[PDB]
Design a protein around this nucleic acid. Structure first.
Lengths: 229, 166, 123, 338, 167, 37
RNA sequence: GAUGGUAGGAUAGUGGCCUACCAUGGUUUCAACGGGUAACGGGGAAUAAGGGUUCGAUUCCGGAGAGGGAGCCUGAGAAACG
RNA sequence: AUACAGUGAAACUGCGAAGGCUCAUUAAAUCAGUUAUCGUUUAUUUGAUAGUUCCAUGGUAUAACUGUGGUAA
């Protein structure tokens, strides 16, 4: 009854935890019970993960948010107070949620793909992201599928990454879900299979969608740290 | 009303053997409230949470708009002479959207004499109604959904556009 | 160009642009045609996907019946049986489409029972 | 003791008016007599109970049992109604503002059929059972309840008909048209017999006849107009008439006799705001029934002196006349309270 | 019949089983609210007037004030079909309720000469007759909310002005 | 003219009512000597 | 209402979803429309098991029903198992 | 603790039950994925988001409760 992304062992139970509503969707997130209890194993059961949630160790996106099924989606920096645990969780190359450990100056921010820019009411420019941070007043040159950098103390955009040909992009969606390498090709079609294409070890080619891909930095310099093997 | 579904009827291919289903809640066709003239009574019906809908049946105080200056002012209703979305609708003298209804234009006289001084540049076949009192004006607002009677006056081109018709 | 009642007019001569690589002809920007559901001035907005094919019949007005044959890699009897599709489409003030006439259409806002596509191109 | 309006040396009373210590001396006769802000058409069945009142928004049927003084049900019908009849008890036939016809039963909604053009009136024939329905144009249709067929529709004049009625003791089909002609057809022959023309002395504009009626002697015919002018007719010198201008005169809609109770040769006229009652052979007003709101139509209960209107307000008014007659057996303490 | 009688201002009420129905027949065909005399229901209570206030009949069914029809009928009350006796009183009432609004000629050692008091005095301030620190804090939090929000809004609108000047 | 005037026979109304033999209390000779003119 | 156009009604809104008017359309041999079951079986609908090769994990057979049809009401969600 | 002060039958309240059997046989119309809704509803989740003032605190009307009762209920 589980998805593939959670890295959930089959010998666990019968009812799978539906995440509650929140920032991200159901299909692109993992809740805190499947995060803490059975992935990096700070708990043994739902009772004691509710106990540490009542103790309020979790500090995801700089706020506490004491809830069992809180849908932590892409790169919400899970922060735990004891042993200064800073966790940025991204996608691995085979579809799961690889939770990388980072440090404090990297967990002081996150980034987010812009979805739409609106002239909503009363002359106010407007920007949303995958956690829905409706932050005030970016520059006019925010296209769709660019990348804002959230402040995580206040909410303001601090840095901006422009989407164009020659940018380091992350793909979350479809049969390319979780690949990095961002350059063999660029092809913007007019309604589907439109993208920037991603290399491999032998620099192979790949096809995805615009909304299923979003930028993380430059060719060699992302200010996100990434795990390795 | 009854329905909103393609299941009771045929598509662009000509199919049969329908016998489909007990009709759901979200195929809700309410009764056609033919709004008339009377004393102002609006039924406050519910839908989709607290989505109150104003179903007007006997509305009078039409806010009709002077066109060339855009002056939406308050007046009464007389009757619709031509509306061939149903040619019996004008026989029964109801009041729906996009109907051409007659208005005693006395507050428009008051506004003209108030912001121009003299009484009577404006077209002659509406100057005749400036003199007489009853001018033609077409309803914009939806009394069956928003419960209101707003409209726009007939001024020249749109006037002859309807007068050549009927 | 007025054969029906009830103030045949644009609904706020009027002119807009859907963008996205589809031209608006100059009579459809400034001309006497009303463009009620032709998407260049229109009331509809564009979205979705864009399909291309030749026609079969343009008998009634505001009905463009496209044909659409396409390749599909059949593995069953290992030969390609040829595709055919149909879609009705509203008019545009740019081309009286006759038989032949490969044209393309964009998805928007169901107009009749079966039309979501309106002509944006002729070539 | 309910208050009485002033009149010509006569008394009337209203129950369930717009104004009707009062809370603790309430005089309510029929409980739940109020509709959704208007009223379409009310009529009382042939037997001693079971009055039926058509609806206004989400239109209903509203059968009231007179021997229970309250409501039985409200079948929310599919469309808004204009005209119906009652066919004894439980059966009844209706037609809505669209060109559709409903057949209500004890279970309700036995069938929904249609007529090809928009209809305005319906009557039923007790003899050989064909309902005649008057509509717009050349077309006066039949739906026979014997074998459910259709019949060879009656060819009219140009614009149509506002009201159709058949005579009771002999069957003379009336059809009040627009061009002042009354177009009497014969329910035996399925052909015209006469095309009587209606005249006046004022002649404001080309009026249209809107109300037709007969009574149970079979010799006279009550005629209406779209101007507030009652007319009588006989075969005896059928070209003139006696006329009745009314003091407001918009459109008379209900003209009904008093041919089954005492205080004879009297008739009720009813236009949009007022309903009066006068005597035959002079044309002088016996009484009048001025309410606080307009009137959609009226009806008079048989055997006794009471009237039931359908109006444009929330309740319906009932009007009791203690000089025309008594109050009926189910209202048999109205003569004790007032 | 039994007659419930209530003297309301003294707070007294008692039932009296009165047989001998030609005494009772004064009330007959008189609906609710219409007054009555003591003279034709009794002799020992003359100069008495009772406003009737309903009454349960035998089979216990109540009458509601002012409908018609002194038999039983099936109405719609607080909406379902409940049976209710008519407001007019006839021969078949078990109890009939009465309010005495004027004492006549004889004292009653149940109604007049014996009485009960009330319950308890009022509780509300205006009912006894006939906060300001919260008024400080409400006004202070309101003007502080204004001086926070309406200044911060223009304080990022000026950052929009900086972005527009640099663009 | 599709749904307009279907001259068909319908099922529930085929025996919805029943006729009457004498009907009018007058005679047909009374009809003829009633409106000869 | 078959196919579309114009306007209104109703809608949570798109919509011949319904009605007035108008045009005679539309699908099809490049398989329309119609014929049945090992449609108590099938379609990935899904888990797969270190040798069982169509047994071997499950969601769903279709829609209904709270004595029988009908009408109404409530709610973020219903034509309510209450 | 002479205007409240703990136990607390029976009453208002917040919520509970938050998804269970049988019967007639639908061929991508039942179903599964997918495109879109600047074509639309949305409790709850999450991020955001309010500037019109002439010559010291506002009203009876109902409970629970008492009291008189009816009815086989």
């Amino acid at each position: 009854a589980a998805p593939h992304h959670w890295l959930l062992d089959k010998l666990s139970g019968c009812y799978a935890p539906r995440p509650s509503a929140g920032p991200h969707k159901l299909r692109e997130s993992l809740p805190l019970i499947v995060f803490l209890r059975n992935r990096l194993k700070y708990a043994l059961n739902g009772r004691e993960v509710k106990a540490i949630l009542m103790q309020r160790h979790v500090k995801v996106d700089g706020k506490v948010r004491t809830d069992t099924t809180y849908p932590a989606g892409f790169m919400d920096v899970i922060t735990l107070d004891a042993t200064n645990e800073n966790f940025r969780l991204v996608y691995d190359v085979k579809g799961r949620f690889a939770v990388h450990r980072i440090t404090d100056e990297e967990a002081s921010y996150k980034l987010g793909k812009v979805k739409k820019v609106q002239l909503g009411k009363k002359g106010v420019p407007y920007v949303v992201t995958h956690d829905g941070r409706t932050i005030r007043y970016p520059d006019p040159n925010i296209k769709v599928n660019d990348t804002v950098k959230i402040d995580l103390a206040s909410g303001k955009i601090t840095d901006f990454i422009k989407f164009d040909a020659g940018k380091l992009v992350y793909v979350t969606g479809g049969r390319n879900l979780g690949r990095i390498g961002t350059i063999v090709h660029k092809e913007r079609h007019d309604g589907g299979f439109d993208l920037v294409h991603i290399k491999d070890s032998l620099d192979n080619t790949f096809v995805t969608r615009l909304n299923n891909v979003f930028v993380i930095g430059e060719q060699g310099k992302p200010y996100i740290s990434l795990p390795k093997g | 009303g009854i329905s909103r579904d393609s299941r009771h009827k045929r598509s662009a291919t000509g199919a049969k053997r329908a016998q489909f289903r007990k009709k759901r809640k979200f195929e809700l066709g309410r009764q056609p409230a033919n709004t008339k003239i009377g004393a102002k009574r609006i039924h406050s019906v519910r839908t989709r949470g607290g989505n109150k809908k104003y179903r007007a049946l006997r509305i009078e105080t039409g806010n009709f708009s002077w066109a060339s200056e855009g002056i939406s002012k308050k007046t009464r209703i007389a009757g619709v002479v031509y509306h061939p979305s149903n040619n019996e609708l004008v026989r029964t003298n109801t009041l729906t959207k996009a109907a051409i209804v007659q208005i005693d234009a006395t507050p428009f006289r008051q506004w003209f004499e108030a912001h121009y001084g003299q009484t009577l540049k404006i077209e002659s076949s509406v100057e005749s109604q400036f003199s007489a009192g009853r001018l033609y004006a077409c309803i914009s607002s939806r009394p069956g959904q928003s419960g209101r009677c707003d409209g726009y006056i007939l001024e020249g081109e749109e006037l002859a556009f309807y007068l050549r018709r009927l | 160009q007025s054969e029906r009642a009830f103030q045949k007019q644009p609904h706020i001569r009027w002119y807009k642009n859907a963008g996205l690589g589809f031209k608006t002809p100059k009579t459809a920007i400034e001309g006497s045609y009303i463009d009620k559901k032709c998407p260049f001035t229109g009331l509809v907005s564009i979205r979705g996907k864009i399909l291309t094919g030749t026609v079969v019949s343009t008998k009634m007005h505001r009905t463009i019946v496209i044909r659409r044959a396409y390749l599909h890699y059949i593995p069953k009897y290992n030969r390609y049986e040829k595709r055919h599709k149909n879609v009705p489409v509203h008019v545009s003030p740019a081309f009286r489409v006759q038989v032949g006439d490969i044209v393309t259409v964009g998805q928007c806002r169901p107009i009749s029972k079966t039309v979501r596509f309106n002509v944006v191109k002729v070539s | 003791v309910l208050k009485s309006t002033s009149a010509n040396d006569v008394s009337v009373y209203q129950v369930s008016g717009t104004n009707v210590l009062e809370y603790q001396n309430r005089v309510e006769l029929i409980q739940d007599f109020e509709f959704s802000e208007a009223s379409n058409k009310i009529k009382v069945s042939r037997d001693g109970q079971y009055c039926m009142a058509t609806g206004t928004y989400k239109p209903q049927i509203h059968v009231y049992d007179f021997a229970n003084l309250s409501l039985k049900f409200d079948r929310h019908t599919d469309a808004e109604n204009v005209d119906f009849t009652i066919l004894s008890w439980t059966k009844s036939v209706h037609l809505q503002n669209d060109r559709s016809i409903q057949f209500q039963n004890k279970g309700g909604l036995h069938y929904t059929t249609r007529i090809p053009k928009f209809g305005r009136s319906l009557v039923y024939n007790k003899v050989n059972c064909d309902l005649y329905v008057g509509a717009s144009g050349n077309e006066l249709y039949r739906l026979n309840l014997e074998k459910g067929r259709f019949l060879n529709p009656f060819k009219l004049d140009t614009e149509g008909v506002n009201h159709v009625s058949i005579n009771e003791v002999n069957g003379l089909l009336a059809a009040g048209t627009e061009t002042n002609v009354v177009e009497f057809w014969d329910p035996r022959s399925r052909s015209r017999v006469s095309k009587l023309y209606l005249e006046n002395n004022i002649d404001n504009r080309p009026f249209q006849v809107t109300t037709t009626s007969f009574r149970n002697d079979g010799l006279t015919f009550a005629c209406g107009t779209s101007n507030g002018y009652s007319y009588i007719y006989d075969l005896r010198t059928s070209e003139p008439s006696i006329i009745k201008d009314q003091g407001y005169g918009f459109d008379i809609k209900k003209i009904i006799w008093l041919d089954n109770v005492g205080t004879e040769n009297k008739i009720v006229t009813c236009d949009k705001r007022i309903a009066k009652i006068w005597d035959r052979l002079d044309g002088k007003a016996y009484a009048s029934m001025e309410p606080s709101v307009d009137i959609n139509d009226i009806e008079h209960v048989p055997g006794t002196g009471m009237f039931f209107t359908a109006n444009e307000s929330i309740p319906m008014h009932t009007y009791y006349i203690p000089s025309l007659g008594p109050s009926p057996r189910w209202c048999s303490f109205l003569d004790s309270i007032t | 019949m039994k007659l419930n009688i209530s003297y309301p201002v003294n707070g007294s009420q008692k039932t009296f089983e009165i047989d001998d129905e030609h005494r009772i027949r004064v009330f007959f065909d008189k609906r609710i609210g219409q007054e009555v005399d003591g003279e034709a229901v009794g002799d020992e209570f003359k100069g008495y007037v009772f406003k009737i206030s309903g009454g349960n009949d035998k089979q216990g069914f109540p009458m509601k004030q002012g409908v018609l029809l002194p038999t039983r009928i099936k109405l719609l009350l607080t909406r379902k079909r409940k049976s209710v006796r008519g407001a007019i009183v006839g021969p078949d009432l078990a109890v009939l309720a009465l309010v005495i609004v004027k004492k006549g000629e004889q004292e009653l050692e149940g109604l007049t000469d014996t009485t009960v008091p009330k319950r308890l005095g009022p509780k509300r301030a205006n009912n006894i007759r006939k906060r300001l620190q919260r008024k400080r804090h409400q006004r202070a939090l309101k003007v502080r909310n204004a001086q926070a929000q309406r200044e911060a809004a223009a304080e990022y609108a000026q950052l929009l002005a900086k972005r527009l000047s640099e663009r | 003219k599709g749904r307009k005037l279907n001259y068909s026979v319908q099922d529930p109304i085929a025996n919805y009512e029943a006729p009457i033999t004498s009907g009018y209390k007058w005679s047909d000779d009374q009809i003829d000597e009633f409106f000869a003119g």
